[PDB]
Amino acid sequence: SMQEEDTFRELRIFLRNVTHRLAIDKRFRVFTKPVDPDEVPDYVTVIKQPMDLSSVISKIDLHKYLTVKDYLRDIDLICSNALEYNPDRDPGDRLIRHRACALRDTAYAIIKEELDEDFEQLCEEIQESR
Numbered sequence: 592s593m594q595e596e597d598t599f600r601e602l603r604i605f606l607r608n609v610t611h612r613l614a615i616d617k618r619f620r621v622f623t624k625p626v627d628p629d630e631v632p633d634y635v636t637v638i639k640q641p642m643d644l645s646s647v648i649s650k651i652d653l654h655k656y657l658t659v660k661d662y663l664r665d666i667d668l669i670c671s672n673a674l675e676y677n678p679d680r681d682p683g684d685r686l687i688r689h690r691a692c693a694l695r696d697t698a699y700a701i702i703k704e705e706l707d708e709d710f711e712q713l714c715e716e717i718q719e720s721r
């Protein structure tokens with residue numbers, strides 16, 4: 592219905608606002624663009640499911656997220672890909688991992704303060720009903 596379409600439009604508006612606030616954080620610049628295949632050849636071979644904030648924006652716009660749960664799966668993938676590809680003890684890898692965990696914690700904390708649980712629950716019930 593029109594009412595359900597209004598619900599998903601509000602969700603996309605919410606998800607773009609949260610994603611924008613992550614993307615302008617200087618700590619998360621590395622997560623704003625896909626890994627450039629030129630600069631990093633073995634990324635696409637090692638990370639099976641690349642994800643970054645530019646892809647999250649594209650997915651919002653293609654209506655790929657019907658719930659904040661589904662969006663947070665992609666935030667969690669940006670973090671787990673970073674931990675997976677940069678696992679070493681050296682400062683380079685420890686910095687990326689620290690940033691990856693801060694992106695995940697910041698997204699979860701924004702949503703905890705600003706997502707109405709009844710709004711999420713409506714999104715889940717419309718999604719389940721399809």
Ligand SMILES: C[C@H]1CCCN(S(=O)(=O)c2cc(NC(=O)CN3C(=O)CNC3=O)ccc2Br)C1
Pocket residue numbers: 620621622623624625626627628630631634642643668669670672673676677687691
């Ligand atoms: C090859 C690794 C270097 C450290 C960052 N990781 S990552 O897995 O945390 C990751 C990166 C990007 N995007 C970029 O690194 C984009 N980029 C370049 O490729 C060169 N400069 C630049 O900013 C996106 C998501 C993740 Br999870 C990739």
